[PDB]
């Protein structure tokens, strides 16, 4: 539960902003994808550097890449989550925003 794992913030009819991490979108398919990406990175390391084997740092880099590659997934409406969040919240999701990345009047 760190700022690096903060995926999306969700507003509702109540409008309380509830953070949604990558853990809320984890799945067996995602785990298999991470493992396969780590294996590919290890094979690349074997091809270039020449040292064989699998490293934990490869797994960490694969996790980072997999999490960062899914930043364009969210849209205006996303099903399969509303029937689990809007229930305990009690209010329907009206807005979703990606978290930290990177004259209409006078405002002194």
């Amino acid at each position: 539960e760190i700022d690096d794992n903060r995926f999306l913030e969700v507003t509702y009819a109540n409008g309380d902003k509830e953070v949604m991490y990558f853990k809320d979108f984890n799945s067996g398919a995602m785990i298999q994808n991470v493992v396969d990406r780590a294996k590919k990175n290890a094979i690349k390391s074997v091809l270039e550097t020449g040292q064989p084997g699998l490293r934990i740092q490869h797994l960490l880099d694969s996790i980072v890449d997999e999490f960062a590659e899914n930043e364009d997934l969210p849209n205006t409406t996303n099903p399969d989550d509303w029937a689990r969040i809007s229930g305990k919240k009690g209010e329907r999701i009206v807005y979703i925003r990606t978290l930290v990345t990177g004259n209409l009047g006078q405002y002194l």
């Binding site: 004259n103 209409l104 009047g105 006078q106």
Partner: protein
């Protein structure tokens, strides 16, 4: 939606200011010079507000003449309630800003106007001319050298940027202002000054043959 419609007025107003004539106001040795492109002989866009405070505007006339009248009203009520030397160009500019903001967020249609309030020092006194520009938002900006209002402001503003010279005489500042405005004879120009050398009422129009000699 506050974003669509409070902003909706901003395009509306910007468009109205663009289908108007251009006015310039610049500082020169004897005070401030207003030069506007104005064909009519009756309707004006430059006015005295108080002893040392002048006023120029560009955009729907029924609206900036309404503001002209309101400002005159305000200034005289203050000058009588306190004293003449207490009314300053700064107060006037601030009142126009409050009033244009209140029209922007309440009235049906925003005032398609752009204002410039000018002030010079009193007689025998020394102080730099002050120019303020008040936009339709309610925004107010402090200008050190010149203000350009209405129409396409970029080419005039740039031409003035190259030609401007502090302490230019009346004739030079008139040449610079007409030249940059072109980027017109005495029958299509409205020219007035805030002559800092006058004892009390500084505003003074330059029309007819005297204007002819100056340009």
């Amino acid at each position: 939606s506050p974003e669509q419609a409070m902003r909706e007025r901003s395009e509306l107003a910007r468009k109205g200011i663009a289908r108007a004539k251009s006015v310039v106001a610049l500082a020169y040795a004897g005070g401030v010079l207003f030069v506007a492109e104005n064909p009519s002989r009756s309707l004006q866009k430059i006015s005295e507000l108080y002893d040392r405070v002048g006023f120029a505007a560009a955009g729907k006339f029924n609206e900036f003449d309404n503001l002209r009248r309101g400002g005159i009203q305000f200034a005289d009520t203050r000058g009588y309630a306190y004293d003449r030397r207490d009314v300053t160009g700064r107060q006037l500019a601030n009142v126009y800003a409050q009033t244009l903001g209140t029209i922007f967020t309440e009235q049906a249609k925003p005032y398609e106007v752009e204002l410039c309030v000018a002030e010079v020092a009193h007689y025998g006194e020394t102080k730099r001319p002050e120019l303020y520009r008040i936009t339709y938002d309610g925004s107010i900006a402090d200008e050190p050298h010149f203000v350009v209002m209405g129409g396409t402001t970029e080419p005039i503003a740039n031409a003035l940027k190259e030609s401007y010279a502090e302490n230019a005489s009346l004739t030079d500042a008139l040449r610079i202002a007409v030249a940059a405005l072109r980027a017109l004879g005495v029958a299509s120009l409205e020219v007035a000054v805030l002559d800092a050398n006058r004892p009390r009422r500084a505003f003074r129009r330059i029309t007819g043959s005297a204007l002819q000699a100056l340009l």
